[PDB]
Amino acid sequence: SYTREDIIRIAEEENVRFIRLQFTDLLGTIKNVEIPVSQLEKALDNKMMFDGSSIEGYVRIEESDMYLYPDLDTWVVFPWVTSDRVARLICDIYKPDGSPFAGDPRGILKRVLKEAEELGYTSMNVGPEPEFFLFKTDEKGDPTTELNDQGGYFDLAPMDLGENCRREIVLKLEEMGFEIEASHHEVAPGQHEIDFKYADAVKAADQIQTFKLVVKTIARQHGLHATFMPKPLFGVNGSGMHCNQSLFKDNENVFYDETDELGLSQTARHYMAGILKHARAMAAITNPTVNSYKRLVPGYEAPCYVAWSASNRSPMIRIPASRGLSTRVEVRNPDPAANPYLALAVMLRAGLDGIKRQMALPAPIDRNIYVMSEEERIEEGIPSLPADLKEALSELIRSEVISDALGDHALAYFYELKEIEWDMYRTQVHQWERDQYLTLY
Amino acid sequence: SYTREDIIRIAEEENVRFIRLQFTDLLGTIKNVEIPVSQLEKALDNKMMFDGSSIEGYVRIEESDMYLYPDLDTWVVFPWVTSDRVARLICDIYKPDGSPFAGDPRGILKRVLKEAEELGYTSMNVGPEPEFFLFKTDEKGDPTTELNDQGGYFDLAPMDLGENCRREIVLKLEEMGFEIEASHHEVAPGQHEIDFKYADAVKAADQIQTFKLVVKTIARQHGLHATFMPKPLFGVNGSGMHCNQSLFKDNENVFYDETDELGLSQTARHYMAGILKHARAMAAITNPTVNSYKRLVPGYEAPCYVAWSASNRSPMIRIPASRGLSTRVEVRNPDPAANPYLALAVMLRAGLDGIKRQMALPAPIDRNIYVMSEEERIEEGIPSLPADLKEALSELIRSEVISDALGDHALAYFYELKEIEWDMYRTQVHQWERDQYLTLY
Amino acid sequence: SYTREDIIRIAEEENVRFIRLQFTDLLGTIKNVEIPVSQLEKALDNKMMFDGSSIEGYVRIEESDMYLYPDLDTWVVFPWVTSDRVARLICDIYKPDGSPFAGDPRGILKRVLKEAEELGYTSMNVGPEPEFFLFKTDEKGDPTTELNDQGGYFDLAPMDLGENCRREIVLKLEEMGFEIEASHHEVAPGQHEIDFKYADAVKAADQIQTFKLVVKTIARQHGLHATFMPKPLFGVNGSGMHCNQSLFKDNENVFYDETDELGLSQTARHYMAGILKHARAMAAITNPTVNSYKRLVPGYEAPCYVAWSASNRSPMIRIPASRGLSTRVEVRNPDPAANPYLALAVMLRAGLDGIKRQMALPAPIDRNIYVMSEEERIEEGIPSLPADLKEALSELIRSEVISDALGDHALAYFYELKEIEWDMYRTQVHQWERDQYLTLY
Ligand SMILES: [Mg+2]
Ligand SMILES: [Mg+2]
Ligand SMILES: [Mg+2]
Ligand SMILES: [Mg+2]
Ligand SMILES: [Mg+2]
Ligand SMILES: [Mg+2]
């Protein structure tokens, strides 16, 4: 941990001159304030103010004044090998009267963790597996369509030192103290997955966000463009954020049970059942982009269906073979464009709803695959994820659990943002139409 | 502070070789004289002479001789990391007979501060929030139309070190001793806002001017073009230069009053009424360019209407939630192209007129927004700012307070400059006309 | 004249295969319907229907159905030297219930002529002098900035046969049966003026419309672009439509009076006074474009002032030396972009208002020119035309005569149209601003 005097002493020690008071909006894109070192004490006083309405995004209509409250435990200094070092602080947003802002994703996640703690579970161990694409840039600095390499799954194509981005990312994140479990080449050319070691929910989300920032910074440094867009190119597999989760009460993994046939406790079964039931509802927040539902198509490992299995090509919930303290539930649908705070919050809230209601877990699927008909698919009771973003929004509104989890104020603004996005998308005239048509009719 | 011997000692020890006897004209552009170190003593003697008529601008008809009187308290040295260091002095302009020149903006501001002091208020705490644009340059060194980045409001788009101008400018300004409250990305792509900590009026204006010079210089160093043009591109938000002002009387903020419902003293309300009544008159100076009134259009946060509110999308005056010694008056219409000396002078003079006349403050506007009709708009008593520069000039001439504040000599020359500018602008034939017409007629 | 059987017989003789049922909207642009010859009889039955709301322009909100009633006396056939010859018919617009449409400019002019006849004056002899610009086209067919020739005022620069458009226009208008008084080269390079012989008001307006159509058609044929935009290029003189007008009562020119000192009867003086008083009001309709008020600037023969003179550089009304049946009033301000029906209607309505009210004609101006001051300008009682479109619109609304002449329905739609145009124009950011600014600020 850290304290105010510790921060001041470290700033004096490291010659920190530049401070990034960080936070995030509902849209997920990293937001901040840049501060000189001479204001650091005032920063530690919980007194810095800013617009505040930026949380509502580009649809902000009325201005506010909102204060930044840093979390000292998240202090870190970037290793950018230059004089005038830069420091990072991750902050929460507070109203002028002192109460928390309802619409802050970190506030949402912490509220859901509080309501989890009230249920007796101390923490939620979360480990993500984000993948990113690197594209060669042009002379003006924009990404082109050609990838950085042409290797296959789990390859060594980015070898040597020439534009070896992956090694640089691993080393810088390690020097930042983040626990990197693995790093490797993913299915499509130019796709790199970075595995995190498991950590607490809030700090795991902070790890994901700082991961995105650092990966992009390094990519710009090597003359490449780093993108998390869930399906950048047609015909190649997209980017997934399989998240491994497990509940903890007093450093005890509640999911483990040697008496179970699969070694999964009843609490884990209720958790996964609750995740399954509200899956279509939570898709709108865990798959937030219009592009994301382009990735949920057959033939690219993408899980398009809601059923649980220990091992199958496309189930909603995968239960790994690791047991004991490492037994866990892997939810594979969410993608790197999704907000980690909101995604984890809705996952956990739906899971605790399932736990409280003691929902009956449906049977797992065998090696059986989903070439079956829709009549056969519904005969076995296997629903599917929403086809596109509009159905996801309608399901979100019709769902009374995750709407409560997001909160009344944030729900309206996120719904408005997604309505505007979808309205813009649906009225476009794409080139594919002019290819198919413009000659046939 | 500083003295003559201190200045000489600092120049000797710091190896200062180059001196900028610096001041401003009515047009606002930074003017100066370059001097070698060997004349520094003569510079400290208040004996340097120059044309003097440069204050009148490009319409000077008869030549004068006017002496530069430096203000030693504003001495500073530029840190450009090179041998043969350069030094800055901010000077006032004096007639050969010793009397002050009537047309100097700094002289105008100091005269208005003197007439404020005669009213019992010791000083005016002023903190600006200017914004500037970065445009990528071409091979020949001219600004192009494409911005440097594409981030949203309060973003972290300019990350890393590659052409990261925000960190470098903040650090250089801090090495000047500048009190930088914040620095962040603004609403449009490529728009950067720098927040200053509060300071005295004359020092605040000097801070704004040296701030502009510093930002433009650093942009040149990074191969970028820095502009304050109030509306550089159609369809994007322009530049705002909100000034937060508050009267100080012997380390006492006269505006604060715990007995008030909103925490504004009667003197504060008189200030509000005085600024509101003469708003249309002062717009001609605080919005000097023809382009500025292109920014005062609906839909881009631009306040187009004269009414006061604690929180609204577009009122004349915003009163922040901060209270106590930090209660303030944020006037939002003035833009960075406006001369800070003249803008602050006219604001304070109109406000002091309101204070003396004890003008009755009209009611604030609620969350009600301004889709309401013009007949209703005048029914509710909500006037609007002048549509363009010509009406602003006519209102300025018809106003008997602001014309007095600028002074008889300076008023004529400012009016002549703006008449020439508007006459040049109105007779042009722009490309938009040839787009709409040249085919329809 | 002509009749139904005459039209059918001529169509049989000339092998007319293509009919243009012509008309005009409030915008002035030529509109029509194309019909095959086999429907010609139905066309002569006044039974053809169309949208009708096209008269309101692009601001049409509710759809109608309106019938075309041709005027057989305006039948004419184009001499385009090709098989499958084409014929022209000029039509009025009628409601489905049989009543005239209020918003038709031809209907407006005919109503004003009817109210003139009710005053005892049989007709209005009108002869225009429109000028047009010819620009060289590029490869894709768009006009460039370079003119066709570089001759001076009244020149022979467009000589020979190579792209000698003026002769072609004169010859085709003569085969049209239109009476061409003269044709010559105008002040700026590339400007050709075509003088019409005098005709009745409605037929004169039809002559102007078909004149524009034929000139543009010929220019497209010669690989040139014909434009009537009043001030296409800065620094060159604009395009004017000096209109000569005189009232006729039973082939007797009421204006002539040998007893008058200058040979103008009291009726002519009242007419001129009525035109003078409502000049500012009628400018918005006789100078409709935003570009037109760019032409009303000093130094290019453009009349910018409301005063009458027999001979001066820039009076509102010019009285030529020709007398007897050739006495006339020449109104010089209206431009070729202005609707001829509307301009003639408002001119005549204001003139008859002056005649009825017996307005006292102010004194004429001598060779005195208008380098005199604004204080002098108002001292002599010489008003000026509105500076731009917005002032013209406000004056038009404040006027109770011209608004009545246009009619209640048409006034609202024209006002809305011009408000939209001016609103679009005022919020643009032109290149001239980025030239002056973007470096100075
Ligand atoms: Mg993977
Ligand atoms: Mg996995
Ligand atoms: Mg701002
Ligand atoms: Mg502000
Ligand atoms: Mg002419
Ligand atoms: Mg003439």
Author numbering:
A (entry chain B), B (entry chain F), C (entry chain X): 2 to 442
What does the paper say about this structure?
In Gram-positive bacteria, nitrogen homeostasis is controlled by an operon encoding glutamine synthetase (GS), a dodecameric machine that assimilates ammonium into glutamine, and the GlnR repressor. GlnR detects nitrogen excess indirectly by binding glutamine-feedback-inhibited-GS (FBI-GS), which activates its transcription-repression function. GS generates glutamine from glutamate, ATP, and ammonium by a mechanism that involves the initial phosphorylation of the γ-carboxyl group of glutamate by ATP and the subsequent incorporation of ammonium. The structures show FBI-GS binds the GlnR C-terminal domain within its active-site cavity, juxtaposing two GlnR monomers to form a DNA-binding-competent GlnR dimer.
Thus, we next obtained cryo-EM structures of apo Pp, Lm, and Sa GS to resolutions of 3.16, 2.85, and 2.13 Å, respectively. These structures revealed that, like the Bs apo GS, the Lm, Sa, and most of the Pp apo GS states are dodecamers. However, a small percentage of tetradecamers were evident in the apo Pp GS sample. But, due to the small number and limited side views of tetradecamers in the data, we were unable to generate a 3D reconstruction of the apo Pp GS tetradecamer. Nonetheless, this finding, along with our FBI-GS-GlnR structures, clearly indicates that the current paradigm that all bacterial GS enzymes are dodecamers needs revision. Interestingly, overlays of the individual GS subunits show that the apo GS subunits are similar to those in the FBI-GS-GlnR complexes (rmsds of 0.5–0.8 Å for overlay of 400 corresponding Cα atoms between GS proteins). In this conformation, key active site residues are not properly positioned for catalysis. In particular, the Arg62 side chain is rotated into the active site preventing the proper positioning of the catalytic Asp50´ side chain and Arg316, which assists in catalysis, is moved out of the active site. In fact, the electron density for the active site regions of the apo GS structures are poorly defined indicating flexibility in these regions. B Cα superimpositions of the Pp apo GS dodecamer (blue) onto the Pp FBI-GS-GlnR dodecamer (magenta) and of the Pp apo GS dodecamer (blue) onto the Pp GS-Met-Sox-P-ADP structure (green) underscoring that the apo and GlnR bound structures are similar whereas the GS-Met-Sox-P-ADP shows large differences not only at the level of subunits but overall oligomer conformation.
